[PDB]
Amino acid sequence: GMTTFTLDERLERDGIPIGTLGLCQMRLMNDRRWPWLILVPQRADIKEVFELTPLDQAMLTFETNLVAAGLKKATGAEKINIGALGNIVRQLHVHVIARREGDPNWPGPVWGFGKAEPWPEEEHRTFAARIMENL
Amino acid sequence: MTTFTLDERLERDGIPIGTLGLCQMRLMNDRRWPWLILVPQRADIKEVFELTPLDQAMLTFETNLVAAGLKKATGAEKINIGALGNIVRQLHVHVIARREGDPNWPGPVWGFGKAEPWPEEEHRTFAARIMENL
């Protein structure tokens, strides 16, 4: 069950915890160049989205989409990018990223682009609050 | 009836291979990675959350059905799924077969290098194989 679920150490390291939904832990990717969240469904040994039970796939869909709408509202973003890649970290996690023309590497992907710029402490606390107020 | 029309660039860049309930399926004309797009057949949708909730659930079911089928078809180590839409605003979901050693592994296919078109016979064969495995 969910209470014994272990977050992957690299997601632990690279992401700041900002809360849990029902199925998914939410983390703010520690790269302030784009407002970037990850959703980590708290099921053991899941690598592909299709490995989730049907109901968990549904839960993830709507948690993802609630967060995407919320992120867009909180940032004033032109476009959300959603991604389940996992070439690096195999534990299933869904990227939900706020984008706009002129942001770094627009219109290309955030993934693998340049060097992460970490969030100042207080600024990510304020932003986490802002996300939670907009979900 | 729908006024949905496939964006001209997705038409040009993708080779149709079939249709499910919600989504049309195209094979991105870039043989470097086995790369599909699912285009939900709903008028003027940009974000996943602009679909009705039933369509959102359907998009996930179809995306995951295709992801499972593409893995089987390709022996992929990993499937990558992306709904980006910075270049083509029309909602479409990329579903991509990956493996160690493939071009730009482990990074993204999007924006990497120059597309290598599929030979005619090869994409026909590959399309049948995807459809067999869904």
TrEMBL record, chain A:
GO molecular function list: catalytic activity
Boundaries of every HIT domain copy: 37-106
Q: Which domain of life is it from?
A: Bacteria
Its name, as the record gives it, is HIT domain-containing protein
